[PDB]
Scaffold this active site. Sequence first.
Site, PDB file in Angstrom:
ATOM      1  N   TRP A  80       0.806  -1.223   0.000  1.00 31.93           N
ATOM      2  CA  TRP A  80       0.000   0.000   0.000  1.00 31.93           C
ATOM      3  C   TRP A  80       0.840   1.276   0.000  1.00 31.93           C
ATOM      4  O   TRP A  80       0.309   2.349  -0.300  1.00 31.93           O
ATOM      5  CB  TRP A  80      -0.943   0.004   1.210  1.00 31.93           C
ATOM      6  N   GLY A 114      -6.971   5.370   0.813  1.00 36.17           N
ATOM      7  CA  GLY A 114      -5.849   5.759   1.648  1.00 36.17           C
ATOM      8  C   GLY A 114      -6.224   6.780   2.707  1.00 36.17           C
ATOM      9  O   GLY A 114      -5.366   7.534   3.175  1.00 36.17           O
ATOM     10  N   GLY A 115      -7.505   6.833   3.081  1.00 37.49           N
ATOM     11  CA  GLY A 115      -7.933   7.734   4.138  1.00 37.49           C
ATOM     12  C   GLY A 115      -7.838   9.217   3.822  1.00 37.49           C
ATOM     13  O   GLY A 115      -7.871  10.027   4.745  1.00 37.49           O
ATOM     14  N   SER A 196     -12.467   2.378  -0.478  1.00 40.23           N
ATOM     15  CA  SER A 196     -12.181   3.075   0.787  1.00 40.23           C
ATOM     16  C   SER A 196     -12.349   4.578   0.599  1.00 40.23           C
ATOM     17  O   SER A 196     -13.454   5.017   0.220  1.00 40.23           O
ATOM     18  CB  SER A 196     -10.802   2.631   1.284  1.00 40.23           C
ATOM     19  N   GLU A 323     -13.925  -6.229   7.039  1.00 40.99           N
ATOM     20  CA  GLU A 323     -13.409  -4.864   6.905  1.00 40.99           C
ATOM     21  C   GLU A 323     -12.580  -4.410   8.113  1.00 40.99           C
ATOM     22  O   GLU A 323     -11.573  -3.709   7.955  1.00 40.99           O
ATOM     23  CB  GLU A 323     -14.561  -3.877   6.699  1.00 40.99           C
ATOM     24  N   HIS A 436      -9.876  -5.503   4.437  1.00 41.65           N
ATOM     25  CA  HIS A 436     -10.109  -4.226   3.766  1.00 41.65           C
ATOM     26  C   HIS A 436      -9.067  -3.994   2.677  1.00 41.65           C
ATOM     27  O   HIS A 436      -7.865  -3.916   2.964  1.00 41.65           O
ATOM     28  CB  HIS A 436     -10.059  -3.090   4.796  1.00 41.65           C
TER      29      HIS A 436
HETATM   30  O1  LIG Z   1      -7.059   4.258   4.761  1.00 42.65           O
HETATM   31  C1  LIG Z   1      -7.029   4.905   5.845  1.00 42.65           C
HETATM   32  N1  LIG Z   1      -8.213   4.922   6.607  1.00 42.65           N
HETATM   33  C2  LIG Z   1      -9.538   4.286   6.380  1.00 42.65           C
HETATM   34  C3  LIG Z   1     -10.585   4.936   7.334  1.00 42.65           C
HETATM   35  C4  LIG Z   1     -10.185   4.828   8.762  1.00 42.65           C
HETATM   36  C5  LIG Z   1      -9.377   5.772   9.384  1.00 42.65           C
HETATM   37  N2  LIG Z   1      -9.167   5.340  10.691  1.00 42.65           N
HETATM   38  C6  LIG Z   1      -9.807   4.113  10.966  1.00 42.65           C
HETATM   39  C7  LIG Z   1      -9.903   3.315  12.081  1.00 42.65           C
HETATM   40  C8  LIG Z   1     -10.612   2.154  12.049  1.00 42.65           C
HETATM   41  C9  LIG Z   1     -11.284   1.756  10.834  1.00 42.65           C
HETATM   42  C10 LIG Z   1     -11.200   2.569   9.719  1.00 42.65           C
HETATM   43  C11 LIG Z   1     -10.467   3.770   9.708  1.00 42.65           C
HETATM   44  C12 LIG Z   1      -5.802   5.647   6.209  1.00 42.65           C
HETATM   45  C13 LIG Z   1      -4.583   5.371   5.566  1.00 42.65           C
HETATM   46  C14 LIG Z   1      -3.426   6.093   5.906  1.00 42.65           C
HETATM   47  C15 LIG Z   1      -3.453   7.104   6.870  1.00 42.65           C
HETATM   48  C16 LIG Z   1      -2.203   7.847   7.203  1.00 42.65           C
HETATM   49  N3  LIG Z   1      -1.186   6.824   7.571  1.00 42.65           N
HETATM   50  C17 LIG Z   1       0.122   7.471   7.291  1.00 42.65           C
HETATM   51  C18 LIG Z   1       1.286   6.487   7.527  1.00 42.65           C
HETATM   52  C19 LIG Z   1       1.290   6.064   8.996  1.00 42.65           C
HETATM   53  C20 LIG Z   1      -0.087   5.480   9.400  1.00 42.65           C
HETATM   54  C21 LIG Z   1      -0.382   4.124   8.726  1.00 42.65           C
HETATM   55  O2  LIG Z   1       0.129   3.077   9.202  1.00 42.65           O
HETATM   56  N4  LIG Z   1      -1.169   3.935   7.614  1.00 42.65           N
HETATM   57  C22 LIG Z   1      -1.415   2.621   7.019  1.00 42.65           C
HETATM   58  C23 LIG Z   1      -1.644   2.685   5.521  1.00 42.65           C
HETATM   59  C24 LIG Z   1      -2.974   2.042   5.138  1.00 42.65           C
HETATM   60  N5  LIG Z   1      -2.812   0.930   4.223  1.00 42.65           N
HETATM   61  C25 LIG Z   1      -3.831   0.019   3.901  1.00 42.65           C
HETATM   62  C26 LIG Z   1      -4.867   0.318   2.969  1.00 42.65           C
HETATM   63  C27 LIG Z   1      -5.857  -0.627   2.706  1.00 42.65           C
HETATM   64  N6  LIG Z   1      -5.880  -1.862   3.296  1.00 42.65           N
HETATM   65  C28 LIG Z   1      -4.860  -2.173   4.224  1.00 42.65           C
HETATM   66  C29 LIG Z   1      -4.942  -3.506   4.822  1.00 42.65           C
HETATM   67  C30 LIG Z   1      -3.969  -3.891   5.749  1.00 42.65           C
HETATM   68  C31 LIG Z   1      -2.922  -2.979   6.093  1.00 42.65           C
HETATM   69  C32 LIG Z   1      -2.842  -1.728   5.498  1.00 42.65           C
HETATM   70  C33 LIG Z   1      -3.863  -1.318   4.546  1.00 42.65           C
HETATM   71  C34 LIG Z   1      -6.993  -0.336   1.670  1.00 42.65           C
HETATM   72  C35 LIG Z   1      -7.195   1.167   1.266  1.00 42.65           C
HETATM   73  C36 LIG Z   1      -5.849   1.764   0.952  1.00 42.65           C
HETATM   74  C37 LIG Z   1      -4.951   1.649   2.233  1.00 42.65           C
HETATM   75  C38 LIG Z   1      -1.222   6.507   9.033  1.00 42.65           C
HETATM   76  C39 LIG Z   1      -4.655   7.404   7.522  1.00 42.65           C
HETATM   77  C40 LIG Z   1      -5.817   6.687   7.179  1.00 42.65           C
END
Ligand SMILES: O=C(NCCc1c[nH]c2ccccc12)c1ccc(CN2CCC[C@H](C(=O)NCCCNc3c4c(nc5ccccc35)CCCC4)C2)cc1
Length: 527
Positions: A80, A114-115, A196, A323, A436
Amino acid sequence: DIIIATKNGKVRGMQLTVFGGTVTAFLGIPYAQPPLGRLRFKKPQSLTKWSDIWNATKYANSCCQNIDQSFPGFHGSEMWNPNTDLSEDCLYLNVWIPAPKPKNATVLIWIYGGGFQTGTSSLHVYDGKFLARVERVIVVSMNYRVGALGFLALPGNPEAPGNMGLFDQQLALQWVQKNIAAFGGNPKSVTLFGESAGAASVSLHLLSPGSHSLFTRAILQSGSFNAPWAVTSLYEARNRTLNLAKLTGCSRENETEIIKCLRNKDPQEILLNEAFVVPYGTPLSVNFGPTVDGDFLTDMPDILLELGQFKKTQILVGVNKDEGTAFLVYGAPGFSKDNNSIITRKEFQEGLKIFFPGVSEFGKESILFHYTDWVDDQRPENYREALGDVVGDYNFICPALEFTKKFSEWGNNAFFYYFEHRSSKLPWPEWMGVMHGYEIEFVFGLPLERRDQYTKAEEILSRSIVKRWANFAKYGNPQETQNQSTSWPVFKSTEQKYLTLNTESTRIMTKLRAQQCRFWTSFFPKV
Ligand SMILES: O=C(NCCc1c[nH]c2ccccc12)c1ccc(CN2CCC[C@H](C(=O)NCCCNc3c4c(nc5ccccc35)CCCC4)C2)cc1
Ligand SMILES: *[C@@H]1O[C@H](CO[C@@H]2O[C@@H](C)[C@@H](O)[C@@H](O)[C@@H]2O)[C@@H](O[C@@H]2O[C@H](CO)[C@@H](O)[C@H](O)[C@H]2NC(C)=O)[C@H](O)[C@H]1NC(C)=O
Ligand SMILES: *[C@@H]1O[C@H](CO[C@@H]2O[C@@H](C)[C@@H](O)[C@@H](O)[C@@H]2O)[C@@H](O[C@@H]2O[C@H](CO)[C@@H](O)[C@H](O)[C@H]2NC(C)=O)[C@H](O)[C@H]1NC(C)=O
Ligand SMILES: *[C@@H]1O[C@H](CO[C@@H]2O[C@@H](C)[C@@H](O)[C@@H](O)[C@@H]2O)[C@@H](O)[C@H](O)[C@H]1NC(C)=O
Ligand SMILES: CC(=O)N[C@H]1[C@H]([C@H](O)[C@H](O)CO)O[C@@](O)(C(=O)O)C[C@@H]1O
Ligand SMILES: *[C@@H]1O[C@H](CO)[C@@H](O)[C@H](O)[C@H]1NC(C)=O
Ligand SMILES: *[C@@H]1O[C@H](CO)[C@@H](O)[C@H](O)[C@H]1NC(C)=O
Ligand SMILES: *[C@@H]1O[C@H](CO)[C@@H](O)[C@H](O)[C@H]1NC(C)=O
Ligand SMILES: [Cl-]
Ligand SMILES: [Cl-]
Ligand SMILES: [Cl-]
Ligand SMILES: [Cl-]
Ligand SMILES: [Cl-]
Ligand SMILES: [Cl-]
Ligand SMILES: [Cl-]
């Protein structure tokens, strides 16, 4: 040599071999002025014409963003993270077209998730060459600004009005309207799809009048604007903007003077302090997200949804079985991808404090009451499974179902799916189930590549999903008409039929998560 004349100049692509045929890719076409210097935090500005041949033969820079460092060396998380250089100079898009060049092809436009803080269109699982080869559609994807650089908000102030990343997306939709016919595409047959925060973005284009004429239909995978993480209140946004100013030394009284001070900071200083503007936030906090800016978004979008103020068209919406589980290993105590994460009642209660930081004690007890009425009080995975379901139902499943009900009540055809297949190659442990983001590779047809170690049942599943998605985009109806497939019924607010997607048997079911979503949609908003 494939050179296409666009409205702003010629672009050169490259030939790709896919499944014994050819796909033409144009990777990294600019669609806006680079948002640098005085243009940082502003809406994207129109691109000025060039006269040479722009070489669209490699993915462009990804937008500045913080990086997941929780699992260095681990493919499940590193897949990701961005896979091209980070740069503020990142407003580029990609085009995959079939070979030979089509005559009037339907166009699929991908918006990554990616939030609203991370993401890039160049990820391997967003590679559009399989869709173009197999279904003869054109696939478009764009990079849009994320984090504070994309969503910093001082409402009404054009130096930082908010929603800039959404306007990036919009200007790319506009690029497709003006240019895709030169690539053999039909600008009158454009389907947005995303996952997402990309799906939440799609749902906001359905609500934005400026996007109404820029697309035909919409697909929402695991997201919608009414999800609790998807829209930042104007109160939060202002407090977060002022917090960023204080952390960077940019606090002033003239709000415009703040923005000008923030414009002299290196992107790295903005990124580092971004992460701290929300003191007691959830894991993966959406620090800078969409706001009601009075431009892209004219009112609180819950009001717009309830009162029918959105583009009247067909939608395809769905969610995955588990999810919530991915988020548990980014902060819930007792959890680890490297053991079976059997947690205690006390750890469960601690987990609720992590994922519901602003909520009263009574609100958290109410979650516990509704998710701990066990069928068998002795199963040791009870609390582990309950926390994943809490997080997934609250953040994804119940908002997606509520969006689909309210949208369909105004007369349009809607189709809902429940994806329940766990990838045979999944590098995450089994307790996390159907995670997810892990339907995306099936939608993009990666299991069609027999070399990639997916099973035969997964090839067939991806083939059927690809056809249903292409048929939805071309014809508004996600059927597979040739292989004696289960027919996908319309989702209505009364019976609420949905289709399950798996390798064994697709089934028509009704009223997904009925009891849970009555809790989250009817009761929990009151607490
Ligand atoms: O996407 C976000 N938020 C959704 C809604 C939501 C927010 N807060 C929740 C609390 C609870 C539930 C929902 C929510 C999100 C993404 C990145 C950030 C910012 N970063 C910056 C780097 C450090 C830290 C991090 O470690 N970021 C991890 C990267 C994410 N990578 C993954 C993605 C997918 N699947 C994954 C499956 C396994 C592992 C990683 C997966 C699919 C979509 C693309 C990204 C925070 C903030 C929010
Ligand atoms: C390409 O096809 C369009 C029609 O697209 C169809 O209808 C869209 C609304 C879309 O949702 C899909 O169902 C189809 O792909 C042609 O549009 C026509 O343009 C002429 C212009 O003279 C106009 O008179 C017609 O009313 C249009 N038809 C429709 C249905 O809108 C367009 O001409 C085609 N272009 C090429 C180069 O083949
Ligand atoms: C599962 O692991 C978690 C996390 O512990 C880390 O990861 C393990 C794989 C192992 O390498 C440990 O040494 C690591 O510390 C365990 O949760 C921890 O439990 C301890 C109790 O000794 C507690 O003090 C820590 O704060 C916990 N860490 C977190 C992040 O919650 C958990 O106990 C393990 N569960 C099972 C069933 O083995
Ligand atoms: C853009 O690309 C031009 C052509 O590239 C070369 O020819 C084609 C057929 C491909 O095989 C490609 O791999 C070759 O390198 C160059 O002549 C031109 O200099 C390039 N322009 C810029 C600005 O890089
Ligand atoms: C600025 C940036 O991030 N990348 C640029 C890279 C790197 O500067 C070099 O590869 C050295 O790392 O160079 C290019 O000429 C290239 O070959 O694509 C243009 C590209 O925009
Ligand atoms: C934002 O809100 C938090 C919590 O209410 C507070 O601690 C912080 O000081 C606020 N920031 C500003 C700039 O007022
Ligand atoms: C702030 O600065 C800008 C430009 O320097 C100026 O136009 C404006 O009048 C100043 N004051 C306020 C309250 O915006
Ligand atoms: C339908 O089944 C045939 C084999 O009988 C297969 O080749 C084809 O790809 C399938 N089509 C879809 C859309 O699943
Ligand atoms: Cl400048
Ligand atoms: Cl700078
Ligand atoms: Cl118990
Ligand atoms: Cl199937
Ligand atoms: Cl029923
Ligand atoms: Cl009901
Ligand atoms: Cl209830």
